[PDB]
């Protein structure tokens, strides 16, 4: 005789042994397709993924026979709770088929979007014809027609599908005892029964709103400065106190304001730090780039890259006629196999992305000893916040000066530092309100608070209120503007990007305090500090085997999100932004619209 | 001079699985151990109860050579007192031990593109193995009260599970060949000697 706890351990022992091999075969099948685009490899990849999915589906039903109230062990309960979740299988078969065909129709319409230029000889798609218009242009009419055209083409067809998708996904969320689909999405940050290290699905909204409340004052100053600089480009189309039009935000959706840097650079007479010229003066090859990236992690106490990493990985574009996918990725194939795929070049940007990808690899090698079902990050935001702090350190002048890429007599001006902080602020600070607003709108749409007939009367109302962006042309309910984004159309949660930004700066501040660095945070370098690698490895080792609140406490010292380190990082830029905005009005009045007058 | 056939235990086409390992008795010969510890091929050469040097100066009555193939992370379980799956259910060593453990990587031979599933190990057993005991029974395991009567079902698992070896796996997941020499000493003319 045995307790349930001693039978659900045997079941998991069998499950690990089968699943490791099946998942490794699936990952090898996918790797052979990404590094060699052909026709046979697609079919092989499809077969492998289907086999793995079928096995996981059967084991999900198999795991439900053992109850969770009769299990005392925390790790066993976490492992079984990870496997017990079913997903869309709880619905009826016809409803599941309808959901699958609706999602496939949405993916097909988004990927095959077509817009017609007023010049009949030109037909443009989003990638890359429309994007080249959006990012690189300085006229008003072309951006206006492109911005309205893409929405007018895709939203009309995507709007009717979204309502059915919402009601069906809400039904599926009711199947698993979740209130709505938003709660199902917020269940990735929930910790239950741990004790003091607990977190509720309704607490995430409170923490997000509280954190955004502190961030708003800095964003208002940055918004006012960008508006004043936008005076000189479109004098007759922007109000001195109105919201910025949505089609002048640097890209298609306004997610990042990086493309506005050439227009809004503080001191345009000072060139940014670029070590590509001296990187080609020493005949640096790609393998040297990855070797210095490896040395950076060696110096702080983290382990060394495995031998198979050097042989199996595709560290450069092949020249034998093979066609590849050039998106930089770090692969954890399983069974101790770690690889990196990158069509790298001799440039500074690729030199930074090498450190980022190797940081992902280091996390994967760090949590490899945990049980199979606990080999992930603490939540969705941990894995992509570890990588960014490596690129933060790899770009500091102290790192390149000690690397030989800069002369020891190099003198850095405060003007260059202000330029660097402005370009950092356009990407990081400028994207937070958009992410928070979009995810709030989706949450309230799923919750049923917003009626179906009032979808575009609130979407813009929040956009003016939270983001300070006004529409250029009025839209009716026949439009579906949120569906014009890649992540919304393909059913992807968006709140991970908000929390990752907070976690990355908490991690940077803690690791810089460990190294006993003195001065502003944006100058911090953690190279040669073997004491910070131990603190990092205290958090990296746990994986998904301890609650994310305790994993956060192990490296920072607190078990909650905090934006104070983020404001600390941008303090020198804020002290310069207030002086510039001293003679300009801050804040946006919602009443003024370009279409009203 | 009749030298012991150490070249047919370390130098072999096919090795045995962990659950059913191969034992060879060596007696009535002279043993030149100098070839072994002076070879750089072996990655693990741990001698318990004796010294690797001066080993060929004592005479024993029998030597047993047990050979098998395991993973990289399971070589640490071939030692007196260690616990795991290999130690508990496949190959157990007594707490007192007079012998040596030799292990070397065999990725080039035992790993094939697509997997080499010819090596098995026992994953489930009612009780731990006694020292130097071999179990080759193939009966359905049972973790529930109700007997399943020879057909795999719910809570009834087959106890022997296969090994998946591929050339691209990590060092910890790559096959390793292990030979365990045990020198036994009884009252006898002490046939096995040194040079
Ligand atoms: C196994 O073969 C190699 C190759 O000649 C040889 O050097 C080695 O001595 C052999 N092993 C033994 C135990 O003799
Ligand atoms: Zn990344």
Describe the protein's architecture and organization.
The complex is a heterodimer of chains A (597) and B (195). By secondary structure, chain A is mainly alpha-helical. Among the domains of chain A are: 4-86; 94-255 and 429-495, Neurolysin, domain 3 (Orthogonal Bundle). Chain A has helices at residues 4-34, 40-63, 74-84, 93-111, 126-135, 140-175, 181-186, 203-231, 261-264, 276-279, 286-299, 307-312, 348-366, 383-394, 397-401, 414-427, 432-447, 455-467, 486-489, 496-514, 530-540, 548-555, 564-569, 571-581, and strands at 115-116, 123-124, 244-245, 329-334, 337-341, 469-470. In chain A, the strands form three sheets. Chain A has a two-stranded antiparallel sheet. A two-stranded parallel ribbon of chain A has the order 3-6. The longest helix of chain A has 36 residues, at 140-175. Chain A is globular, with a radius of gyration of 25 Å. With 195 residues, chain B is mainly β. Chain B has a single domain, classed as 2-Layer Sandwich (Alpha-Beta Plaits). In chain B, 7% of the residues lie in helices and 21% in strands. Chain B has helices spanning 34-37, 86-90, 107-110, and strands at residues 22-26, 44-48, 62-70, 99-105, 120-122, 160-162, 176-184. In chain B, the strands form two sheets. Chain B has a five-stranded antiparallel beta sheet. A two-stranded antiparallel sheet of chain B has the order 5-6. The interface between A and B is medium-sized, with 23 and 19 residues. The complex binds 2-acetamido-2-deoxy-beta-D-glucopyranose and zinc ion. Residues 356, 360, 384, 387 of chain A line the site of zinc ion. Residues 6-7, 10-11, 35 of chain B line the site of 2-acetamido-2-deoxy-beta-D-glucopyranose. It is classed as viral protein/hydrolase. The entry lists the keywords complex, viral protein/hydrolase, VIRAL PROTEIN-HYDROLASE complex. The assembly is dimeric.
